[PDB]
Design a protein around this ligand. Structure first.
Ligand SMILES: [Ca+2]
Ligand SMILES: [Ca+2]
Lengths: 211, 387
């Protein structure tokens, strides 16, 4: 048995939002051991709803649960900025003894945009003496954390030797990411220049280095 | 001579104390079996206490982990009433982790269930001689009353359950004659759940009060005659009889789903549309015991009752309870008198010990002056083996 969950839901502050588990309701005379969890990045999940309409002590009454047919729903009223986290549903069945849903990433909208600050470094002389070359493209202070990177050498796109990280939230609620281009010292000084283009929300910022 | 069993239940107005064995208290020093699921059954001459041992004695290292209800070491044994279940006074009946026993009037019938969970076999003995066997038909743990069966006119009857304990299972009625299974019927009871029935004969028929472990906080029941034609239902009273249960509220003649999950073996005596209900005092744990007379509880759904008699204090441990009768052949009366026993579970999971065992108290119904009190186990836990 599988519990399906929307991959992403988004709302504004003050808005109400409903996530929906659409899995286990089965086995007619059996009961419903359905529960919900909230998980902030780098922390353990927190039980928000169990037993489907019940809520444990300390959890804000803005969270409530319901179920109709084979679909359970978690309703969050008066969306606050701290509610932005990942949400999971769970259920106990005779067949399978718990199933955590795929998860739903809740985004609280309204926050201002931010273009990425990009810094590009050429390979060091000390690295070229070791017969290696690596281009370092560093992406900082962009909001939200969605971005894609394309490398080029004299207007020609290059795919070989590109290692790009996933975005990560900084301490200032903005995101960061880095991309690395590996080259032999021949490919570096034979070409005219190298560029790292960072496209963010349709706006592309570019930086270029050359030997 | 055979036990006729054509008399109706004697009408009762109370409960007088019949026995108390003080097992666990005496088990701290003496050699006493670690037991669980005890029950009383009477012949036309005497009464005996049957019980499922764990092949171990109290305050011994072999009583470790004796929560597990099923092991190749559990045996059905019996001793006189009010006596401590010691290897020096206990008679062996059968190898079983689930049992039932009754006397048709000429010989003890014992039903012992052992084997694996998927292939459990009930060994039937008549006068200690193996007379029949019956194998699990659904390959999920086969279990029986854990109380006395009911004999009428020379035929004894019992209930067995095969299947899930948390869902719909299979339930069968049997009619044994001299230890030989002569007829059986599988009950057509969808959405019902039957476990550990307390069966008593009542004017040539039998009515079992059982435990709904799946979705029931009231007790299911089934009544049948010698041809095994049966009727099913639930005790309608708003005085809920199972443990756990909800607070007393509007009841139902069907299963009450509120706190309907797993329960406790119990009993009840139907008198027209009245019912004597034995239940724990607590709503959540197995604490205390009381008898409640509801004059319309068998068919009515209100929570009103007229009589309540205390048995065990609300603060002290209780456990399984079951019915047992004393036939006119034994008592000389003109009606089959009802009685009941109470198991007093001590140790795990509720207490800090390595073991689980129980003692017993018993009461018989009389139409005379009685009193309510608390007759608890009384053992001071933990024992020396638990340090
Ligand atoms: Ca129950
Ligand atoms: Ca009533």
């Amino acid at each position: 048995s599988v519990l399906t969950q929307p991959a992403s839901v988004s709302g504004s502050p003050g808005q109400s939002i409903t996530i929906s588990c659409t899995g286990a309701s089965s086995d007619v005379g059996d009961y419903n051991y359905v529960s919900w969890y909230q998980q902030h990045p780098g922390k353990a999940p927190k039980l928000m709803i169990y037993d489907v309409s019940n809520r444990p002590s300390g959890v804000s009454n803005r969270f409530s649960g319901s179920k109709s047919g084979d679909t359970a729903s978690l309703t969050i009223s008066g969306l606050q900025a701290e509610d932005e986290a990942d949400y999971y549903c769970s259920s106990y069945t005779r067949s399978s003894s718990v199933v955590f849903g795929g998860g739903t990433k809740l985004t609280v909208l309204g926050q201002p945009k931010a273009a990425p600050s990009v810094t590009l470094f050429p390979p060091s002389s000390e690295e070229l003496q070791a017969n290696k070359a690596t281009l370092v493209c560093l992406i900082s202070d962009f909001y939200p954390g969605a971005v894609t990177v394309a490398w080029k050498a004299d207007s020609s796109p290059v795919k070989a030797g590109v290692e790009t990280t996933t975005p990560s939230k900084q301490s200032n609620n903005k995101y960061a990411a880095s991309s690395y281009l590996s080259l032999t010292p021949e490919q570096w000084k034979s070409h005219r220049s190298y560029s790292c283009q960072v496209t963010h929300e349709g706006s592309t910022v570019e930086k270029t280095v050359a030997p | 001579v055979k036990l006729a069993g054509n008399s109706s239940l004697c009408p009762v107005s109370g409960w007088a104390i019949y026995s108390k064995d003080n097992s666990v208290r005496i088990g701290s020093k003496g050699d006493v079996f670690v037991i669980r699921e005890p029950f009383i059954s009477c012949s036309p001459l005497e009464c005996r206490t049957f019980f499922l041992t764990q092949g171990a004695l109290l305050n011994d290292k072999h009583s470790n982990g004796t929560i597990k209800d099923r092991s190749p070491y559990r045996t059905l044994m019996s001793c006189p009433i009010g006596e401590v279940p010691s290897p020096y006074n206990s008679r062996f009946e059968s190898v079983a982790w689930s049992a039932s026993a009754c006397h048709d009037g000429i010989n003890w019938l014992t039903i012992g269930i052992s084997g694996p969970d998927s292939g459990a076999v009930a060994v039937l003995k008549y006068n200690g001689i193996i007379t029949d066997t019956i194998k699990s038909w659904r390959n999920n743990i086969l279990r029986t009353q854990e109380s006395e069966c009911a004999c009428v006119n020379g035929s004894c009857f019992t209930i067995m359950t095969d299947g899930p304990s948390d869902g719909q299972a299979s339930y069968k009625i049997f009619r044994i004659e001299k230890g030989k299974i002569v007829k059986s019927v599988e009950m057509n009871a969808p959405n019902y759940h039957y476990e550990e029935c307390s069966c008593y004969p009542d004017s040539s028929e039998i009515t079992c009060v059982c435990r709904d472990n799946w979705h029931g906080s009231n007790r299911p029941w089934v009544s049948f005659n010698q041809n095994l034609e049966y009727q099913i239902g639930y005790i309608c009273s708003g005085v809920f009889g199972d443990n756990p249960r909800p607070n007393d509220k509007t009841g139902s003649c069907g299963p009450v789903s509120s706190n309907g999950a797993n329960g406790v073996k119990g009993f009840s005596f139907k008198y027209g549309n009245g019912v004597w209900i034995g239940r724990t005092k607590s709503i959540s744990s197995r604490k205390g015991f009381e008898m409640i007379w509801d004059p319309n509880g068998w068919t009515g759904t209100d929570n009103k009752f007229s009589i309540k008699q205390d048995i065990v204090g609300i603060n002290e441990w209780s456990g399984y309870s079951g019915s047992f009768v004393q036939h006119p052949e034994l008592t000389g009366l003109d009606c089959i008198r009802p009685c009941f026993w109470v198991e007093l579970i001590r140790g795990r999971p509720e207490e800090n010990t390595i073991w689980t065992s129980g003692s017993s108290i018993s009461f018989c119904g009389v139409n005379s002056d009685t009193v309510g009190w608390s007759w608890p186990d009384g053992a001071e836990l933990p024992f020396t083996i638990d340090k």
